[PDB]
């Protein structure tokens, strides 16, 4: 049972607009709390979670300091678009993407489990900080350019400094100040629907609404036999109020609904539930 502070950067040039765009959002667990986007007048870091409406009280410069860090980040990765685009001898015509993901996994009492910093170029892994946090792995030759540059500049020492101290300390800050939102386990409202296809076939759907965090496991069983491979599993979706929804369906011979049972696993439930359909 760990918690995570994660930051997601995206810089991309698009065909019909000179000057690339930069988006920078941060998550605690499955809760977004901050954003930055350079497509604004004076682009600023802004709150996207209720407990961050209060953060100016304990840290009046948080918004100014984080606006500074993101506006600089926007600049370095717009040049990075040009650099990597040149490594691959690509032309100015195309549209390309640099993504960054960095953060930390912390255990029960301020215990750093893992730290990471990863970069993708056009959606493929480019360079990443190793788990030891003192070395990198580069994907291809063009990434070796970067790794050799970063090795020279000893940028891992600066990275591990943030990840070992600042990342941990800010996760704990956010978990305490956003207790009502972050340290919460909302079990799902589960119920099964029945939709016939023909005289002999039926679709049984197992819903799960309003659960947090996002991790969940829906499972259909037939007389205790596992039926995951015959299952139709929707991808879990947000509901707009900070929670998630998901369903699993499976097709069954009509008049035999009651031999099949849905199985729900969620952190917010006292123990997994096995469901059944009833007229």
């Amino acid at each position: 049972g760990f918690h995570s502070l994660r930051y997601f950067y995206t810089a991309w040039s698009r065909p019909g607009s000179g000057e690339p765009r930069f988006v920078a959002v941060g998550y605690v667990d499955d809760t977004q709390f901050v954003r930055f986007d350079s497509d604004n007048a004076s682009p600023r870091a802004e709150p996207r979670a209720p407990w961050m409406d209060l953060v100016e009280q304990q840290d009046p410069q948080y918004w100014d300091r984080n606006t500074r860090n993101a506006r600089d980040a926007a600049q370095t990765y717009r040049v990075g678009l040009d650099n990597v685009r040149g490594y691959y001898n690509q032309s100015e015509a195309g549209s390309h993407t640099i993504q960054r993901m960095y953060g930390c996994d912390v255990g029960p009492h301020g215990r750093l489990l893992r730290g990471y910093d990863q970069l993708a170029y056009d959606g493929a892994d480019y360079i990443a900080l190793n788990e030891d946090l003192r070395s990198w792995t580069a994907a291809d030759l063009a990434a070796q350019n970067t790794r050799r540059k970063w090795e020279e500049a000893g940028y891992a020492e600066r990275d591990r400094a943030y990840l070992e101290g600042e990342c941990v300390e800010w996760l704990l800050k956010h978990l305490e100040n956003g207790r009502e939102t972050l340290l919460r386990a909302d079990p799902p409202k589960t119920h099964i629907t029945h939709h016939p296809i023909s005289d002999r076939e039926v679709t049984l759907r197992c819903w799960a609404l309003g659960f947090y965090p996002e991790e969940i496991t829906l499972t259909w069983q037939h007389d205790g036999e596992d039926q995951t491979q015959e299952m139709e599993l929707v991808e879990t979706r947000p509901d707009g109020n900070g929670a998630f929804q998901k369903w699993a369906a499976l097709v069954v011979p009509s008049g035999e609904e009651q031999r099949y049972t849905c199985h729900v696993q969620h952190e917010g439930l006292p123990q997994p539930l096995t469901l059944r359909w009833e007229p």
């Binding site: 930051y7 920078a24 941060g26 930055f36 870091a45 948080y62 300091r65 984080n66 860090n69 993101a70 600089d72 980040a73 370095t76 990765y77 040049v79 990075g80 650099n83 990597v84 640099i98 960095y102 970069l119 480019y126 360079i127 970067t146 540059k149 970063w150 500049a153 940028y155 600066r158 990275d159 943030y162 600042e166 800010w170």
Partner: peptide
Amino acid sequence: DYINTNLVP
């Protein structure tokens, strides 16, 4: 905080 040091690739 956003990390305060980004190195260009």
